[PDB]
Amino acid sequence: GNDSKKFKGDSRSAGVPSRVIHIRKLPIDVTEGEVISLGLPFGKVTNLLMLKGKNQAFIEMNTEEAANTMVNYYTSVTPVLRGQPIYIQFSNHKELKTDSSPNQARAQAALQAVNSVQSGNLA
RNA sequence: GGGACCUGGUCUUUCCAGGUCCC
């Protein structure tokens, strides 16, 4: 039926079992909240890496259906941040990590603004 | 051989390819 061999895939293909998205030609003046904001209307986002020093970015969806729908819309449209359109496709990686730049400190902090409860009972 | 400038590719922060200018 509508089913297929979705058990494998890569960044140059679609239907990947991985929950990771990649963005190319990423703008410079753009921030961690923008890379999250383009993936939010597509489902829950639970990880993020800003690849500053390069025009690239990475994010992780909490669900495979959120990642599947995101690129399935972005496979026919190009997202834009601060008014600047840039390319997107699946990531070749699996689960978000950071191992090569201090820029990991800003990406792991921006996710807290998009996931905290911010309720008035806090102190 | 070196430097500067522009565009494209890109899979973890870069790297790579092409064009232009100067020594």
For the domain covering A1-123, report its CATH number: 3.30.70.330
For residue A22, what are its two tokens? 């990649």
Q: Is A83 left (phi over 0), alpha (psi -120 to 50) or beta?
A: left
Residue count (chain A) = 123
CA distance A119 to A123: 10
The phi and psi torsions of A111 (rounded to 5 degrees) equal -65, -25
Secondary structure element (H or E) that encloses residue A68, with its range: helix A64-74
Determine contact, residues A76/A64, Cβ cutoff 8 Å: no
Which nucleotide has its C1' atom closest to residue A11's CA?
Answer: B11
Method of determination?
A: NMR
Closest CA to A106 of A30, A46, A61, A48: A48
CA distance A96 to A19: 9
CA distance A11 to A20: 9
Distance B21 C1' – A76 CA (angstroms): 40
For residue A101, what are its two tokens? 């730049």
From residue A33, alpha-carbon distances to A3, A40, A46, A47, A122 in Å are 34, 10, 13, 12, 23
Positions of chain B reached by protein Cβ under 7 A: 9-14
Rg value, chain A, Cα: 15
How does strand A84-85 pair with strand A56-61? unpaired
Query: Any idea where the domains of chain A sit in the sequence?
Result: 1-123
The phi and psi torsions of A32 (rounded to 5 degrees) equal -65, -30
CA distance A50 to A33: 10
CA distance A19 to A90: 8
